[PDB]
């Protein structure tokens, strides 16, 4: 009568290019569907002549070196790749980019995390891991995550990109590496000041200019969470908290520096998304939309309900906890 | 490492291409992924805007309405389109075929004996069947396999022809009818003399020419299980059989003619198959070899080993009943 998992009927592909779209209620193979789907629909495996097998097998390769962390796995590494896929929808980015860089955008998204071990920077830098020795505390993560996208490249098997003569691959790869990097959240203040510098008199034909939007657009998607439907967005909340405090609990265990932030004694939901919609989404979003006005009503309007939410939550556990005293 | 079965491996994805690809092997799901790659590795994906996801679809309604038999059934359909498939590598078709003309001969491959109940045209007619009735005795089979086709590709989700221009859709529509028709064994000797006539001087640009060879061609490929390694070979012919033996069983038992081919009491495997390759498939493809020399080597030879591999077992059967029969 009707057909598998796996391939996604119309109702879906309509769905998967809006940022509504509903995250959880889909599994690891159908999710592998839908980002299958995406290189077609974007018109990538026409124009850089990927091998639609290869695609697969790659796909596959990609979600075998994601971890079963609360957070930082392959449901989330889907997320962002979805988010991509809306705004290049949402915001017409194929008027603004070439293939090539929509083909950077949507690798990117989705290689952004692997292997991800589930404690961050710092932890690997305080506690001198293997991957902090390895890259003399630099980025470590992000450079792990790319030094790992490009091995699964490597192998024949998954290579998608060995139709490229290798002055593509070489701006490719450069891209990406640009890109996986500038996801670390040190980095963030930087990278917000030197957008918001070139904003003031933007080109979509300087190079550097279009290098900084880029980031910017995977910075978005890496954090696009909160900018969800409450319903979608509020458990990736739980699970980021539960893989912050299994870090302080071993940070604490072991004698090593415990971030307030991430302090199971000090956090509280709601002042952790306060700060965080307000001051480091917001204005992040806001940037985006002088480029593409569209955003607002999409991406902002809900970040404004969600802070809304938020701080009306906050006076709900201020007054309960008040009352538990005196 | 493990990769899932329905991922192709690049040997498997090689062996495709080859006529020695042996058919056994597989599920109903890697025989689908096969197919599915045959139509992008031609470029009728690309070419004919093929939503991916569509092809998928109508691949698994296709093996939906293949039924149970010993022989016409799903795996037969598969062995065919991919002798096609092989033939358009072997003998560089796409030199001489438009990508229109390559789509009707892999489409009407895997449709040309939809629905199939296991018994052939002559018991439908003197069995005065319900298919005999609607189709007037005129190639009852054939003419249903079609109309299933069409009802497949009917419905809106299954419509691999959906961006095609209606002028499209009749040309391919009317090749996919001329060639499904073709397939009906009835018709092999009106056929044969129609060729060999053009023969005598072929002309690649003439329209009844080149309708003619696509008919031997898809008349080649569904019989051409005869043309691969004998461990692949034999059981087709086993299978075929018992598909003759439950027909002739049921024609005595009602009353009705008996086909001396068919009779369990008068056929021996040997002596069956080395008439078939004698006076059917060997004249058949030596016309051919005259159009594409290359098919001797590859088709032919394999033939000859056939006819006096079959010989020997003739002799050692015949051996048998000398001892039997009383
Ligand atoms: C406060 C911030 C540095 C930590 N931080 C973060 O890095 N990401 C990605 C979040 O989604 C987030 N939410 C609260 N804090 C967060
Ligand atoms: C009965 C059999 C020896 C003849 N025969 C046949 O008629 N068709 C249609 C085949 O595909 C086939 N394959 C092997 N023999 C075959
Ligand atoms: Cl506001
Ligand atoms: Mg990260
Ligand atoms: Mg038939
Ligand atoms: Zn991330
Ligand atoms: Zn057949």
Chains 1, 2 share one sequence.
Request: with cysteine; charged share 25%.
């Amino acid at each position: 009568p009707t057909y598998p998992k796996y391939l996604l009927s119309p109702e879906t592909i309509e769905a998967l290019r809006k940022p509504t779209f509903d995250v959880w209620l889909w599994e690891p193979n159908e999710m592998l569907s839908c980002l299958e789907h995406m290189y077609h629909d974007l018109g990538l495996v026409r124009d850089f002549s990927i091998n639609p097998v290869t695609l697969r097998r790659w796909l596959f390769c990609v979600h075998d070196n994601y971890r079963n962390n609360p957070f930082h796995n392959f449901r989330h590494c889907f997320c962002v790749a979805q988010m991509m896929y809306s705004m290049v929808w949402l915001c017409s980015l194929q008027e603004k980019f070439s293939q090539t860089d929509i083909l950077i955008l949507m690798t990117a998204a989705i290689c952004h995390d692997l292997d991800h071990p589930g404690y961050n920077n710092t932890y690997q830098i305080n506690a001198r891991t293997e991957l902090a020795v390895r890259y003399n505390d630099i980025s470590p993560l992000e450079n792990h995550h790319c030094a790992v996208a490009f091995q699964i490249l490597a192998e024949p098997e998954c290579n998608i990109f060995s139709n490229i003569p290798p002055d593509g691959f070489k701006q490719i790869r450069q891209g990406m590496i640009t890109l996986i990097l500038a996801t670390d959240m040190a980095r963030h203040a930087e990278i917000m000041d030197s957008f918001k510098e070139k904003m003031e008199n933007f080109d979509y034909s300087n190079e550097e200019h279009m290098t900084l939007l880029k980031m910017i657009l995977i910075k978005c998607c890496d954090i696009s969470n909160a900018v969800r439907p409450m319903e979608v967005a509020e458990p990736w909340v739980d699970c980021l908290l539960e893989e912050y405090f299994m870090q302080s609990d071993r940070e604490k265990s072991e004698g090593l520096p415990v971030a307030p932030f991430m302090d199971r004694d000090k956090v509280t939901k709601a002042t952790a998304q306060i700060g965080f919609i307000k001051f480091v989404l917001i204005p992040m979003f806001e940037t985006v939309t002088k480029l593409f006005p569209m955003v607002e009503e999409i991406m902002l309007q809900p970040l404004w309900e969600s802070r809304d939410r938020y701080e009306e939550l906050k006076r709900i556990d201020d007054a309960m906890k008040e009352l538990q005293k005196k």
